[PDB]
Amino acid sequence: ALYVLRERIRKGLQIYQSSVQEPFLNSSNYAELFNNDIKLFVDDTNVYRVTVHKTFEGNVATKAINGCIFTLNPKTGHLFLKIIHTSVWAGQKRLSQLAKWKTAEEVSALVRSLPKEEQPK
RNA sequence: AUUUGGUCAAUUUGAAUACAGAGAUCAGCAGUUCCCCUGCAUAAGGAUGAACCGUU
């Protein structure tokens, strides 16, 4: 009830919590992806992969493999796959955070490489 | 120095019920006009091709 009241108050005032300013890609605006404007999907999910090898049964075996930064142009179908080598992560700490930064850097580099015409919106 | 700018509406009444008052948001497509291209028709108007002789 209290929460509801708070919400109502907010509405009245038109205060809102940050969230994110940019508009989310969604089922609603999925069709927006395939207009003439140039775009690039980026994925940092595969940058620091650890592996714990597991078969159909699930037997244990430890290792830490190479990663990648999947960066895809859905118009042209190009895939600027920056392969992150495992040597990067040797003697490092706060690893996940570092990975994100690395990914960002890579993206920036890619952008720089692309000319003004081919660059993404 | 005092005070007016402060009456919820709606319903049931002969004060009670109500309690602020009753589709939103996102997205297609077609039409309307003008333009451009393309194919066809209609008129008109060209331009040109095609062996070899014809008809009382």
Swiss-Prot record:
The protein's superkingdom reads Eukaryota
Q: Which cysteines are joined by disulfide bonds?
A: none
Task: From the Swiss-Prot or TrEMBL record, state where the protein is found.
Answer: Nucleus
Residues of the signal peptide: none
Give the multimer and partner information.
Answer: Component of the U4/U6-U5 tri-snRNP complex composed of the U4, U6 and U5 snRNAs and at least PRP3, PRP4, PRP6, PRP8, PRP18, PRP31, PRP38, SNU13, SNU23, SNU66, SNU114, SPP381, SMB1, SMD1, SMD2, SMD3, SMX2, SMX3, LSM2, LSM3, LSM4, LSM5, LSM6, LSM7, LSM8, BRR2 and DIB1.
Q: What does this protein do?
A: Functions as a scaffold that mediates the ordered assembly of spliceosomal proteins and snRNAs. Required for association of BRR2 with the spliceosomal U5 snRNP, and the subsequent assembly of the U4/U6-U5 tri-snRNP complex. Functions as a scaffold that positions spliceosomal U2, U5 and U6 snRNAs at splice sites on pre-mRNA substrates, so that splicing can occur. Interacts with both the 5' and the 3' splice site, as well as the branch region. Has a role in branch site-3' splice site selection. Associates with the branch site-3' splice 3'-exon region. Also has a role in cell cycle.
Note from the entry: Present with 468 molecules/cell in log phase SD medium.
The UniProt comment on domains reads: The MPN (JAB/Mov34) domain has structural similarity with deubiquitinating enzymes, but lacks the residues that would bind the catalytic metal ion.
> What is the protein name given in its UniProt record?
Pre-mRNA-splicing factor 8
UniProt organism field:
Saccharomyces cerevisiae (strain ATCC 204508 / S288c) (Baker's yeast)
* Region of the whole protein represented: 1811 to 1931 of 2413
